[PDB]
Specification:
One of its GO terms (molecular function) is calcium ion binding. This is Lactoperoxidase. It catalyses: 2 a phenolic donor + H2O2 = 2 a phenolic radical donor + 2 H2O; thiocyanate + H2O2 + H(+) = hypothiocyanous acid + H2O; iodide + H2O2 = hypoiodite + H2O. Belongs to the peroxidase family. XPO subfamily. By secondary structure, the protein is mostly helical. It has one domain: Myeloperoxidase, subunit C. Helix content is 32%, strand content 5%. The strands form six sheets. It has a two-stranded antiparallel ribbon. Strands 2-8 form a two-stranded antiparallel ribbon. A two-stranded antiparallel ribbon has the order 3-4. A hairpin with a 6-residue loop joins strand 9 and strand 10. Helix 7 packs across helix 8. Bound molecules: protoporphyrin IX containing FE, a molecule of 3 linked components (NAG-NAG-MAN) (2 copies), a molecule of 2 linked components (NAG-NAG) (2 copies), benzhydroxamic acid and calcium ion.
């Protein structure tokens, strides 16, 4: 038999064979094979892993060893000589709002999570790594090259730890090391509810039987909900500001707090759960807290799927969408809904769409006062700005009137993320997401760029001349070549994002294929897909295709003018209409009588 083996990080409890709801861990979605899709299982491999020693070591761990005859360049150099750029002018997407970049972060979070390894608390393994930069075990440092400013100021390297893997978390030796996805593979709102039983419970307001999610006690937004604070101390949200001491938010996903905007979207989804939960009491008064919790939750899952598949993917896969995601013909038991290891790196394209600053706007959408615009890095793990500086209406207006950063070949990643990133584990805004990303592709044992080129049925460059034509850019290919000595060693992340963009989307051929495939799979393979004959009622369905993110805002904030098409660029006030004119969720085909 196949490696029908491992699974140790795995929880395990049972399946009700005809239940009308998703489990909290994704289990039992597939009847033949229960665990398919579930949290805490290895990420799927669409191709064999590629390691230095064959089973666990990454390329660029042993200095002597080469990859196809050449040394792999240090990550931070690829970052320095290619990704980075100085001039922020003319870098914004003329036809995408900031929201376009944010919604993506929400979905890449709903689908995947690889926790780093961590067995070294109260040991000097966190110090033997940050302070002394000595490789070993799960400490895989990002070493700085020569001619690097950070050298003169931060040390020899940036600490970095390898991602957790299945079976244990200690020394494993026989099949190749596979990394862990720690959230459910189906798009189901597990970022709002959590992917664990342990946790979905702590997020809920059980004390009361209305199916409410627990909200913040200490603070309220002009009389509105706030994700609840988190116990865990030292939470670094109070480190960026020791005077204010405002903890991070506790949510379905642990990353809710990296940045003030993602934290804002998490609050817009929480309120809406409660808004639906309490409206569902009004129409079906004999429904218990659990019943309310589920049908409410079950809906939000639909809101996310719809918007994702209706308003988000076609302006991304562009014209390529149809070549990958055929219309929906119904659940197919033979499809593997799992998230592949490569997709988790393919979705990081969203990193080139992050602008350099976040704006705050007043009611007539104007600069919210003196310091209304802040550079991005002052917002990593920043909760005090929301709590003590306006709430979210000013911020949410921002995501609409403002634009995303257009990914473009000469300016890729903003400096805010490439030079001034802040990590929870350490205490300096001084990391590089590009380098970190590039190392991560290696930690996970990812096959080179041309492998994937071949996998998707695309040509495969072997020469500068070949690379110039594919990338359609002479200088870019040249630098890629000077560093990788062969298109075959080019880390897929940099590989994928350097290809020009497909017509009407925001990503190239390769990446369109990888993403194109994954969402096709998580849709055809989701038994709880919302367009699935059975999940909701026929009337209930027509009710739902009437949703917009524009409506979501109106119901949960005090913004009165929003646009009809939140994702594409929209100016105020021409493209801004008042809430009263926006279609709404008719919760009646839900209204029960006789239950
Ligand atoms: C201001 C915006 C953003 C910030 C500050 C940010 C920050 C980060 C950080 C620190 C990591 C951990 C990386 C690693 O250790 O390997 C990460 C991972 C990641 N990000 Fe982002 N990110 C942002 C936006 C986005 C967007 C917009 C997308 C997609 C549209 C995205 C997709 C991903 C993916 C796929 C990962 C690896 C995830 C996993 O599987 O655990 N990110 N980000
Ligand atoms: C950490 O957060 C602090 C509060 O959470 C923040 O200090 C607060 O912000 C400013 C200080 O410049 C003050 O706010 C308003 O009042 C001043 C006059 O004092 C006005 O001139 C300003 O326009 C402003 O609207 C608050 O009084 C101050 N609060 C306290 C208790 O001092 C810090 O700025 C943050 N520090 C860091 C390093 O991020
Ligand atoms: C800014 O981006 C927008 C999306 O990329 C774009 O609007 C879209 O243009 C498409 C053409 O690809 C139109 O196509 C739709 O036509 C009818 C609706 O009348 C529908 O039956 C079809 O399904 C089809 O999607 C749309 O009108 C629009 N996109 C959507 C999803 O409706 C803008 O043109 C861009 N702005 C500029 C100035 O270029
Ligand atoms: C159900 O979905 C699966 C997707 O994995 C489909 O699998 C295809 O079936 C063919 C047989 O005709 C296999 O050779 C391939 O694995 C898949 N086709 C292609 C072109 O790759 C399956 O056909 C779907 N079937 C139904 C009835 O829905
Ligand atoms: C959710 O459960 C109940 C229901 O709202 C919350 O109790 C309310 O608390 C606020 C002030 O904290 C006041 O409206 C009343 O004291 C309570 N009203 C009712 C109807 O009970 C409780 O605060 C929430 N639970 C959590 C953990 O926040
Ligand atoms: O994975 C993140 N964002 O997508 C993230 C991870 C660790 C610390 C801060 C942010
Ligand atoms: Ca999920």
């Amino acid at each position: 038999s196949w490696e029908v083996g491992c699974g140790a990080p795995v929880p395990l409890v049972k399946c009700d064979e005809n239940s009308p709801y998703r489990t909290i861990t994704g289990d039992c979605n597939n009847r033949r094979s229960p665990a398919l899709g579930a949290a805490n299982r290895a990420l799927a491999r669409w191709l064999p892993a590629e390691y230095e020693d064959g089973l666990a070591l990454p390329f660029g761990w042993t200095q002597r060893k080469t990859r196809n005859g050449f040394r792999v360049p240090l990550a931070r150099e690829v970052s320095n000589k290619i990704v980075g750029y100085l001039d922020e002018e003319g870098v914004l997407d003329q036809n995408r709002s900031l929201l376009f970049m944010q919604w993506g972060q929400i979905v890449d979070h709903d689908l995947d999570f690889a926790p780093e390894t961590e067995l070294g608390s109260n040991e000097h393994s966190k110090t033997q790594c940050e302070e002394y930069c000595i490789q070993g075990d799960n400490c895989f440092p990002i070493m700085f090259p020569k001619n690097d400013p950070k050298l003169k100021t931060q040390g020899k390297c940036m600490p970095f730890f390898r991602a957790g893997f299945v079976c244990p978390t200690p020394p494993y030796q026989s099949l190749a090391r596979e990394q862990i996805n720690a959230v459910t593979s189906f798009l189901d709102a597990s970022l709002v509810y959590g992917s664990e039983p342990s946790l979905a419970s702590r997020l809920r307001n059980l004390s009361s039987p209305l199916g409410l999610m627990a909200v913040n006690q200490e603070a309220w937004d002009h009389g509105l909900a706030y994700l609840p604070f988190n116990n865990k101390k030292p939470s670094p949200c109070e480190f960026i500001n020791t005077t204010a001491r405002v903890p991070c938010f506790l949510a379905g996903d642990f990353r809710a707090s990296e940045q003030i905007l993602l934290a804002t979207a998490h609050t817009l989804l929480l309120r809406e759960h409660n808004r639906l939960a309490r409206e569902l009491k009004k129409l079906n008064p004999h429904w218990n807290g659990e019943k309310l919790y589920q049908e409410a939750r079950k809906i939000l899952g639909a809101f996310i799927q719809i918007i994702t598949f209706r308003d988000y993917l076609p302006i991304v896969l562009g014209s390529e969408m149809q070549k990958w995601i055929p219309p929906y013909q119904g659940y197919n038991n033979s499809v593997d809904p799992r998230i592949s290891n490569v997709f988790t790196f393919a979705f990081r394209f969203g990193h080139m769409e992050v602008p350099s600053t976040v704006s705050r706007l007043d009611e007539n959408y104007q600069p919210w006062g003196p310091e209304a615009e802040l550079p991005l890095h002052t917002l990593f793990f920043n909760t005090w700005r929301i709590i003590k500086d306006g709430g979210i209406d000013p911020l949410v207006r921002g995501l609409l009137a403002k634009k995303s950063k257009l990914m473009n070949q000469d300016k890729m990643v903003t400096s805010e993320l490439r030079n001034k990133l802040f990590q929870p584990t350490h205490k300096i805004h001084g990391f590089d997401l590009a380098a970190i990303n590039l190392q991560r592709c290696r930690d996970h044992g990812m096959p080179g760029y041309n492998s994937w080129r071949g996998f998707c049925g695309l040509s495969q460059p072997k020469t500068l001349k070949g690379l110039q034509t594919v990338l359609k850019n002479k200088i870019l290919a040249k630098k890629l070549m000077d560093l990788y000595k062969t298109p075959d060693n080019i880390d897929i992340w940099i590989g994928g994002n350097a290809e020009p963009m497909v017509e009407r989307g925001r990503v190239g051929p390769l990446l369109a294929c990888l993403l194109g495939r994954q969402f096709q799979q998580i849709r055809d393979g989701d038994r709880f897909w919302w367009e699935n004959p059975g999940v909701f009622t026929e009337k209930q369905r027509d009710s739902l295709q009437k949703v917009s993110f524009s409506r979501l805002i109106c119901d949960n904030t005090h913004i009165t003018k929003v646009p009809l098409h939140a994702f594409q660029a929209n100016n105020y006030p021409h493209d801004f209409v008042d809430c009263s004119t926006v279609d709404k969720l008719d919760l009646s085909p839900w209204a029960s009588r006789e239950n």
